[PDB]
């Protein structure tokens with residue numbers, strides 16, 4: 001509630017600028033697609049993968065300094081970040097490639113879960129006080145449906 | 161916090177209820193004393209160690225669910241928590257003993273710097289937006305003085 005920053009059109013586009021070596025390109029594309037699908041279902045927004053610098057949400061993996069002014073910190077600590085909606089850097093989502101990206105139970109962080117969390121930020125969502133919620137600021141691996149009442153109440157407040 | 165929760169007396173008392181086995185008791189006593197020393201310089205408050213359950217700030221090391229419905233999660237993730245000022249549970253500071261507590265550069269998390277962050281919450285400070293600030297909610301080890309302008313502006317907003 002320093003805003004509320006939101007997108008001002010429904011058909012949001014995204015560009016996967018570059019890839020991590022941790023997973024196959026196809027797997028990465030799918031993790032990101034699944035992560036948008038979670039928000040797609042609960043909002044009037046649609047997400048279209050495009051191959052253009054002019055996409056609303058540009059996705060990159062970057063280690064340390066990746067030229068937006070906000071260095072990653074090597075392994076652990078900061079996992080990723082996303083800028084709230086608006087023009088340019090705003091809306092973009094950056095994943096620290098000093099982390100080990102994976103999917104499923106085990107090593108590293110689920111690219112899916114972390115992307116779903118970053119994309120909530122890329123839609124204008126802040127952190128939730130609810131510990132189970134996707135937008136709670138602490139990563140916990142879960143096999144369960146990632147969205148909870150508080151996440152859905154949050155986007156509904158913005159787009160609903 | 162909610163309505164700027166703050167203490168309404170100047171002589172704040174604390175009780176170290178139990179001890180982690182990670183460090184000598186004497187080192188633990190001194191780590192916590194130093195953490196209070198940092199907030200006493202910039203505030204009207206003084207902190208007196210007492211040996212009573214009626215202390216304002218009760219300090220304890222615990223694991224998982226530990227009595228307050230706000231459970232810890234084993235090694236890593238959540239490090240500690242403290243409650244804003246007020247009666248009973250309010251003001252108290254809990255340290256996850258599934259973490260390794262240490263001092264200096266190396267293993268584990270510095271009890272001194274974590275205590276200092278927790279005690280700022282136990283005085284009524286919320287999280288800071290400024291990544292260097294002691295009240296920034298990401299642990300980074302540092303040898304430099306812990307307080308930054310944002311922390312001290314925060315405490316002065318509460319206690320003048």
Ligand SMILES: CC(C)[C@H](C(=O)O)N(CCNC(=O)c1cccc(C(=O)NCCN([C@@H](C(=O)O)C(C)C)S(=O)(=O)c2ccc(-c3ccccc3)cc2)c1)S(=O)(=O)c1ccc(-c2ccccc2)cc1
Nearest residue numbers: 078079080114117137138139238239240274277297298299
């Ligand atoms: C803003 C970004 C750069 C980014 C993000 O959230 O997008 N990240 C920043 C996150 N940090 C925060 O912005 C933040 C904001 C508000 C609150 C919090 C927070 O409350 N964390 C818990 C704080 N802890 C306690 C406390 O601070 O007293 C307490 C409230 C439980 S703590 O135990 O974790 C803790 C304690 C002490 C300290 C400490 C700090 C300084 C000195 C000494 C100690 C730090 C943390 C964290 S991140 O770390 O790379 C990240 C984290 C989680 C996810 C995620 C992925 C999938 C599913 C769910 C989550 C993705 C990315």
Ligand SMILES: [Ca+2]
Nearest residue numbers: 056088090091
């Ligand atoms: Ca953008």
Ligand SMILES: [Ca+2]
Nearest residue numbers: 074076077078
């Ligand atoms: Ca990192």
Ligand SMILES: [Ca+2]
Nearest residue numbers: 097099100101
């Ligand atoms: Ca990686």
Ligand SMILES: [Ca+2]
Nearest residue numbers: 234235236238
């Ligand atoms: Ca923990």
Ligand SMILES: [Ca+2]
Nearest residue numbers: 216248250251
């Ligand atoms: Ca108390």
Ligand SMILES: [Ca+2]
Nearest residue numbers: 257258259260
């Ligand atoms: Ca321990």
Ligand SMILES: [Zn+2]
Nearest residue numbers: 066068070094
């Ligand atoms: Zn970035």
Ligand SMILES: [Zn+2]
Nearest residue numbers: 117121127137
């Ligand atoms: Zn977040």
Ligand SMILES: [Zn+2]
Nearest residue numbers: 226228230254
């Ligand atoms: Zn507790």
Ligand SMILES: [Zn+2]
Nearest residue numbers: 277281287297
């Ligand atoms: Zn904190």
